Every structure is written in C-alpha cells, then in structure tokens.
Structure 1
Amino acid sequence: NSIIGEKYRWPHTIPYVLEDSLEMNAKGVILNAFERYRLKTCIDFKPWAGETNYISVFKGSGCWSSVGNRRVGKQELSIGANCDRIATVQHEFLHALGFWHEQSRSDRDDYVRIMWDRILSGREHNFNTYSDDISDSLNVPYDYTSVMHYSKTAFQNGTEPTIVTRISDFEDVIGQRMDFSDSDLLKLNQLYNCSSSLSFMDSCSFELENVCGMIQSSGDNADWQRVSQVPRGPESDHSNMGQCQGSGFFMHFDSSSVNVGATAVLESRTLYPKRGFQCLQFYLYNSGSESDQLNIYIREYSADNVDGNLTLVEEIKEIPTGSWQLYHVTLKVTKKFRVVFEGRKGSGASLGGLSIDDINLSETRCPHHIWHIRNFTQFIGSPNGTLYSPPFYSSKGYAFQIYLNLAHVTNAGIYFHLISGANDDQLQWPCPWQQATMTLLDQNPDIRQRMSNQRSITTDPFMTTDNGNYFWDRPSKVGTVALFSNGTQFRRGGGYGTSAFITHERLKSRDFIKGDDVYILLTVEDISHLNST
C-alpha cells in the first residue's frame, strides 16, 4: 500500500498553494482536511514560502494525485468539480504522502475480485497492484473500511459492481467516505514515525484508577467519586453503553448528601497549548436538582504567579435530568494551564448529583451550533423521518435551518436552508460565500478515534434559480412559506446539500447513534478571503 523508497518522503510540514482556479467551497474544505491531519497525525501543512518541492492544489479534471514526493518542484493535486469533500481531500493527500489505494495492496486478490470488463474505458490505472519490491503493507491487515478503498461501484459500466469482496459481508462496507480508518493512521504514522500532533491535547474516559492524572481536592468535605454506577442515575457510564455498560467508569459529584452551596473541584494535570485556541468537550448527567450547576475555570500559570490565575470561563446551569448531555466550551489559553471542573449543590430537591464522562480537549474551534436529536432510531426509514432543525443565526447574522431526511429506504439526506431572520434588512443579498459545515458526530469516547461524517456547502451569490432569480437571495423574496414549532410563520429559502449524506447502514454503525441520541454539529463562516490566494 505504502510506496517503497526514502526519496518519496515529504518533510513533516508540507508546503502548499491553494490555486485561484479552485472552487471557493473546495478551498474551505481543503483547509478543514488539514485540521484532521493536525489532530490525528504528526503531518502539518504550511503555505509555500519558496521551498524546492511543494503541493499545488488546483481545479483540474476530477480528483487525482501523484503517489509520494515526486521531487519535481510544483507537484500538482487536482480537486476538481464535485471533489469538494473532506474525505476526498484526505484520500488524495494520502496518495501525495506515499500511499496507493487499499485495493492496490499486493495481497488484494486474496480479499477482493476486480471485475475488469465492468470498469469504464480509461480508468483501469486506479486498480493496479504493486508487489513487495514496489509496496510495503507495514504489517497491517487488508482494511475493508479504509478511506483509501474504492466502493463496489467505482467507475462501473452499468449496475454490476467492479469490486466484489470475496467475503459477502464486506460488499457494502468498502468505499466509506467519512474519515481516516484506525488502520490508515497506523500505516501513515508508522511511515513518518509520528509521535505527537498539533491539535490533540487530552482524552479522559476514567477507565483507569489514576483518572488521567486528574486531582480532586476540596476544603468543603465534598469530593468527586470514580463510580461505575449511581443508584438515582446513571445506571452506567457514557464510554461503554452499546459495548458492556457496567465495566466502565465516570466521575460523580453527589449532591444528595452535601449542604447547599458545597463545592468539590476536579482539576486536570498541567496542559501545554501549542496553538492558543482550544475546544473542551464532555458528557454531563444530572440526577440531582435543576438548581445544581457546573462551573468551568481555567488556572493559567504565568511567570509573575506560580500559584496560577484562576478564571471562570463557563456556568452550566439548569442541566436537563435523566440523560447524557454533550457540552462544548470555547477556550483561548496561550500559557500552560489546568482545566477546573466545579460542581455546586443548589437550592432545590436533589436525589443524586452531577456525572461527567468522555472529556476531550483539542486545539480546534468549537462548533457554532449543535442540533441534538433524541429518540433518533424511530425516524430511520420512517415516513415521519422528515426533520427540520430549530432556527440558528450565523456569525455574520444570516438566519438558517437544517433539513434532515431519513424517510428514504437506503440513504439519509441533509440540506442547508437560509430562512427569514431579524438582521435581513442590513444583510448582503444574495448571501456571499458563507461556508456551512454539517457534521454527523461519531460519539466515540476518544476524539482521535472519531470517524465523524461531514459535508460542507458554500453560498454562491451568482447561483441562479430555474427561473431568473438568485438561489441565495433574500428568503422573503425567493423562498417558500413555512411554520415554526410554536405556530409563527417564516420564509424558508432554497435547500442545498446532498441526498446521500450517509447510508442508513453506516448511520446505524460506529457511535453516530448513542443512547438513541444524535448530534449534528454546525459551523457557518465567511470564506470570501479565500478568492485571493
């Protein structure tokens, strides 16, 4: 799978150029793809400063790349039409880093059969095998879930598949387009001898007695206890639910046995930031009162104060009872710090306390908005699987809604819609170059093992409708009349996304559904600064 040769190795930081030919949406997606490499690998990217060999990302015919550092200077990489997908950009960069397709492995014929008469004339070069003297498997087995593995339909001539997996169970498994596989990362990190990453900071599921070096100290006689269960709730930890349930642990602040006002803190070990912006995320459970609250502080260690600078950064109040709730906290720490979790028993009828699990800290931006869908499984393949998100306002002030269609018998669809907002009178119309990134979260206990499904679209102010008007024009002017859950009327603009966001079989895999809950993360930002590069 990997190329044989030291000459084909790029430096750990790759010089890049995002050519002006590229689509605006492609540019924003290619930069998001680099963020996945910065969190899961030791491979970084930096804009070309005059280096001998660099990657020139441009809009050619389709999506393609050379395998490994060719040492030709300006090395082309095409992200053409319909290639503006994060996984597609990751795939083509894994080629550039020195990997062939997974079905190109020297042993591929022992796992899959290539139906040669079914491949489109002039696209066979994609199905070439490379022997031991040309390729290295790096002692990793054939991976059907590889992001470098083609789908059964890849360049098919008709309805019959080109790649027939010898084991029938993997027929629909091959060709997944979500993220790197655990096996993909293993080969890549072994090839460049990756030790760290730029974005990853910490993951804490409390599966060991040392609890990721988290210190619990209080002069209030109140303490955070490592438990596998709580009688009032939860019956089991978050980490393992659709796995084993009772063999997993979480921290718990019992409020039932403490005085009102009593606090107990849970501090992290000393953390060293490399970027200056962070995203703290965790799962919370409340079996106590609605008066009970969680406070997030940051203890920054400067030279002028070795005892630290404690600053309150979030007050989580009136936490909904009887279910695990995912929370995100935006941080902007530049010096070494400690995350401080403070539970507080309030004035109200309590019977349990506050539980915390799957704490993940990364140097990335938090999602702008979160759409949390409860009792999800009932909607899969349901006639009533036509869901509309609550309304949301973007950074620049545009009002938007998300439409998730699960009524289909095979694929789930997702669509971005502009809606009539309050700021509409002072906004630029048609909406110019706003990239809306919709992510179906794989709720894995470790951020590094998450294969989240993502799709991004950009608002084109020149995209004209099927009748004279602009697609992204003011919804009051081009949209359809709709009704909010309370009864208030509004105008829903055109819907833009995909009909094949994820298959129902993939949706029901990994941890996209966890505790019958689903989280679709949203980030809408202006990307107009990418037209001039």
Structure 2
Amino acid sequence: NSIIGEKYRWPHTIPYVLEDSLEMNAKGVILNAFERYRLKTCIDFKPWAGETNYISVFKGSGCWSSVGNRRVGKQELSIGANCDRIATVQHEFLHALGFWHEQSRSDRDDYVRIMWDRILSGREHNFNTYSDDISDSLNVPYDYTSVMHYSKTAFQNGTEPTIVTRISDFEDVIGQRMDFSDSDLLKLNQLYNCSSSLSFMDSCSFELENVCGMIQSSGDNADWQRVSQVPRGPESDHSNMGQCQGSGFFMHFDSSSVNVGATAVLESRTLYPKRGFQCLQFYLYNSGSESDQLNIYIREYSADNVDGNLTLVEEIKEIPTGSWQLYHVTLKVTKKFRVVFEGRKGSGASLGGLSIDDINLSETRCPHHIWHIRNFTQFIGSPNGTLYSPPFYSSKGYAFQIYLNLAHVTNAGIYFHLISGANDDQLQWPCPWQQATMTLLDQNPDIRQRMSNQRSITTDPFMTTDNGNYFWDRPSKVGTVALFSNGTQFRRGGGYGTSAFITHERLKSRDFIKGDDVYILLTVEDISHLNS
C-alpha cells in the first residue's frame, strides 16, 4: 500500500496553495478535510510561504494526485468538478502522503478477484499490483473498508462488478468514501511516526475505575457514581447497549435521594489547549424530573491565581426524560483548564437522576445545529421515509430546512432547502455563497474512531432554473408552499444535495443508528471570503 523510499515522505506540516480554479464548494470542502487530518493524524497543512516542494490544489480534469513527495517543487493535485466530496480530498491527500490503492497490494489477489473481461478496454493499468519490492503493506491485514479501495464497479463496461471480493459479505463494503478506516490511520501514523494529533484532547467512556482521571473535589452533599445501570433509567451505559449491559459504565447523579438545590460536581483532569477553540460533547440521560439541570464550568488556570478562574460556560435545563441525548458545548479556552460538570437537583419530585457517558473533547468547531431523528430503523426503504428537519437559522439569518429521503431500495439522499425566515426583508438575494455541510454522525464512543458521512453544497447566487428564476432567490418568490409541524404555511425553496448520501447498508453499519436514533450535524457558513 505505501511507497518504499524515504524521499517519498512529506514534512509533517505540508505547504499547500488553494488556487482560484477551484470551485467555492471545493475550497470549503478541502479545509474541512484538513481538519479530519488534524484530528486523527500528526499530518498538518500550512499555507505555502516559499518552501521548495508544496502541494498545489486546483480544478483539473477530475481529482487525482501523484503518490508521495515527488520533490518536483510545485506538485499539482486536482480537485476539479465532482471532487468536492470530503473523503475524495482525504483520499487524494493519502496518495500525496505515499499511498497507492488498497487493491494494488501484493497480496490483493487472495482477498479480491479482478474480473478483467468486465473492465473498459485499455483500463488495465487502473488495476495495478505492486510487489513488496516497492510497496510496503506496513504489517496491516487487507482492508476492505479502506478509503483507498475502489468500489465493485470501478471501470466497469456494463452492469457487472469488475472487483469481486472473494468473501461475499464484503462485495459492497469495498469503495466506502465516508472517512479514513482504522487501518488507513494505522498505516499513515506508522509511516509518519505519529504519536499525537493537533485537535484531539480527551475521550471518556468510564469503562475504567480511574475514570479518565476525573476527580470530584469535596462534592457538596452528593457526588457522581460509576454505575452500569440505574433502576429507573438507563438500563445500560451509552458506549455499549445491545452489545453488553454491565460491561459498560457511566457517571450518575442520584437526585431522588437528595434535597432541593443539592449539587454534585465532576471535575476533569488538566487539559492543555493548543488552538483556542474546542467542542465538548456528551450523552445525557435524564431519569429524574425536568427541573434538575446540568451546568458546565471551565476552571482556567492563570499564573496570577493558581486556584483557577471558574466560569459558567453553559447551563443545560429541561432535559428530555428516558432517552440519551447528544449535547455540544462551544468553548474558547487559551490556558490550561479543567471541565467542571455540575448536576443540580431542581424543585421537582425525582425518582432517578442525571446520567452522563461518552464524553469527547476536541479542538474543533461545534455544529451550528443538530437534527435528532428518533425511531429511525422503520423509515429505511419505506415509501413514507420522507423526513423533514425542523426549521433553522443560518449565522447570517438565512432560514433553512433539511430533507432526508430514504424511499429508495438502496440509497439514502439528503437535500438542503432555503425557506422563508424573519430576516428575509434584510437578506441578500440570491443567497450568496453559503456552504451547507450535512453530516450523518457515526455515534462511536471515541471521536477518533468515527467515520461520519459528510456532504457540502454552496449556494451559487448565479444558478438559474428552467423558468429563468434564480435557484437560491427569496423563497417567497421562487418557492413552493410547505407546512410546519404546527400547520402554519411557509415557503420552501428548491432542494439541493445528493441522491446517494449513504447506501442503506452503510447507514445500518458502524453506529450511525444507535438506540434507534440518528443525528444530522448541520453547519451553514458564509465562505465568500475564500476567493478574491
């Protein structure tokens, strides 16, 4: 898989240029791909400032790259039309770092079979195999789930698969373009001696007695307890549900047996931010009343006061009861800090308490909005799987709504719709360069192990429809009348996304669907500044 030679290695922080030829959506997508590298690898990207060799992104004839550092000088990397997929970018950058395709391994013939007669005439070289003389597999077994593996249909001349995996269960698995596989990182971080990443800070699932070094101080009246179940709720932790009950722990704040006003605190260990922006996330179960609350503080340690500056960052009230809920808190800490979790019994008859599990902290930007879809399994493949998201407001006052279509026998589609909002009389029409990213969260306990499915579209203010109208014009001009959940009419502008966001088999894989719930993490941002 990897090319052999110390000359085909890039410096850990790669100099890049994002040439104007690139699409606005492409420029945007590329940067989000750089963030997946920063979060999961020791590879970083810095804008070129005179370094002899550097990668040069650009709308070329497709999407491609040379394998490894060719020490040419300006090394080109195409992101032409239909390349502004994130995992396409993560894939063409893995070529640049020194990787060939998965099916180009020396051992490949024992795992997959190449149906040579079904390939397009003259396209044989796209199915090359490299001997361990120039290709090092780095002692990792053959990976079907690789982000560098072709799909069963690559270069097909007809409706028949050119790459038949010898084991039948993996014939559709090959070709995934959601995120890096666990083996993809295993080889990359081995190749580049990656011991630490830029964005990763902490992951806590409480499956160990030392509970990630979380202390509790002199926990007032009550404290948090590492339990594997609470009689009223939940029956199990969040990290392992239909897998194992007791084999899986979480922290619990029993509010049923304490007085009104009683608080219990759980303080993390010292964390050292290296960016100044963080996303603290976690799953909360409420078993008591809606009156109980979970406040969050940040204890920042300045040199003037060695006892910290406790600052209330977010207060979580009215937690829905009898279900684990995903919460995202936006931080902006610059000094060594601790995260303080404070459960607080409200003035309401509680028969349980607050349960917390699967805590992740990264130096990433929180989603602007989240769509929690409950009772998910039955919508897949059903003609009534036409889900519409709650209405949301962009950071620029643009109202929107997401459409999830799961009626197709095989694929699932997502669409971005603008809608009439309160600020419409003050907004710029047509909608200029707002990039909407929709991500289907892989609900894995570890954030370093999530292969969440991400798509982005950028509102082009010059796009027209068959009637000569602007596609992203004011929804009250070019839009169709739709109903809100309360029956109030609204105007919904045209949808725009993809018919193949995820296959139904991929959606049913990994943890995208946990506890029959699904989460669509939404970020709409003005990327107009990327050109000039």
TM-score calculated relative to the size of structure 2: 0.99
Residues 245 and 7 (structure 1 numbering): CA distance in 2 closer, same or farther, change over 3 Å? same
Paired residues of 1:24 and 1:433 also in contact (CA < 8 A) = yes
Paired residues of 1:217 and 1:223 also in contact (CA < 8 A) = no
Shift of 1:227: 0.2
Paired residues of 1:369 and 1:392 also in contact (CA < 8 A) = yes
Shift of 1:378: 1.3
Shift of 1:408: 1.2
Give secondary structure in 2 for the equivalent of 1:57: strand
Paired residues of 1:118 and 1:157 also in contact (CA < 8 A) = yes
Aligned equivalent of 1:169: 169
Shift of 1:212: 0.2
Give secondary structure in 1 for the equivalent of 2:337: coil
Q: CA-to-partner distance for each residue in 1:100-142, whole Å, 9 max, x for gaps? A: 0000011111111112232234543321111011100000000
Q: CA-to-partner distance for each residue in 1:142-201, whole Å, 9 max, x for gaps? A: 000101000001121110111111111111110011000000000000000001000100
| Corresponding pairs, count | 532
Shift of 1:216: 1.2
Paired residues of 1:273 and 1:333 also in contact (CA < 8 A) = yes
Following superposition of structure 1 onto structure 2, how do residues 307-318 of structure 1 map, counting pairs within 5 Å? 307-318=307-318
Give secondary structure in 2 for the equivalent of 1:212: helix
Paired residues of 1:372 and 1:517 also in contact (CA < 8 A) = yes
Give secondary structure in 2 for the equivalent of 1:524: strand
- Partners of 1:71 and 1:36 lie apart in 2 by 25
Paired residues of 2:219 and 2:265 also in contact (CA < 8 A) = no
- Partners of 1:529 and 1:123 lie apart in 2 by 40
Residues 381 and 219 (structure 1 numbering): CA distance in 2 closer, same or farther, change over 3 Å? closer
Give secondary structure in 2 for the equivalent of 1:121: coil
Q: CA-to-partner distance for each residue in 1:278-313, whole Å, 9 max, x for gaps? A: 000000001111110000000000011100000000
Shift of 1:22: 0.4
- Partners of 2:414 and 2:354 lie apart in 1 by 34
Q: CA-to-partner distance for each residue in 1:423-443, whole Å, 9 max, x for gaps? A: 011111110110000000000
- Partners of 2:346 and 2:431 lie apart in 1 by 46
Q: CA-to-partner distance for each residue in 1:452-508, whole Å, 9 max, x for gaps? A: 011111101111111211111111111111111101111110110001110111111
Paired residues of 1:217 and 1:264 also in contact (CA < 8 A) = no
- Partners of 1:13 and 1:262 lie apart in 2 by 49
Residues 315 and 26 (structure 1 numbering): CA distance in 2 closer, same or farther, change over 3 Å? same
Aligned equivalent of 1:487: 487
Q: CA-to-partner distance for each residue in 1:85-104, whole Å, 9 max, x for gaps? A: 00000000000000000000
Paired residues of 1:8 and 1:68 also in contact (CA < 8 A) = yes
- CA RMSD for the aligned pairs? 0.8
Aligned equivalent of 2:518: 518
In structure 2, runs of 5+ residues without a counterpart are: none
Give secondary structure in 1 for the equivalent of 2:259: coil
Q: Which stretch shows the higher mean deviation, 268-277 or 167-176?
A: 167-176
Residues 57 and 219 (structure 1 numbering): CA distance in 2 closer, same or farther, change over 3 Å? closer
Shift of 1:217: 2.4
Aligned equivalent of 1:245: 245
- Partners of 2:46 and 2:494 lie apart in 1 by 37
Shift of 1:220: 2.4
Shift of 1:245: 2.6
Which structure 1 residue ranges, 4+ long, deviate > 2 Å from structure 2? 116-126, 217-221
- Partners of 1:494 and 1:318 lie apart in 2 by 35
Give secondary structure in 1 for the equivalent of 2:454: strand
- Partners of 1:424 and 1:54 lie apart in 2 by 44
Shift of 1:409: 1.1
- Partners of 2:416 and 2:113 lie apart in 1 by 39
- Partners of 1:414 and 1:330 lie apart in 2 by 26
Q: Which stretch shows the higher mean deviation, 115-124 or 262-271?
A: 115-124
Shift of 1:242: 2.9
TM-score calculated relative to the size of structure 1: 0.99
Paired residues of 1:438 and 1:520 also in contact (CA < 8 A) = yes
Q: CA-to-partner distance for each residue in 1:205-233, whole Å, 9 max, x for gaps? A: 00000000000123523110000011111
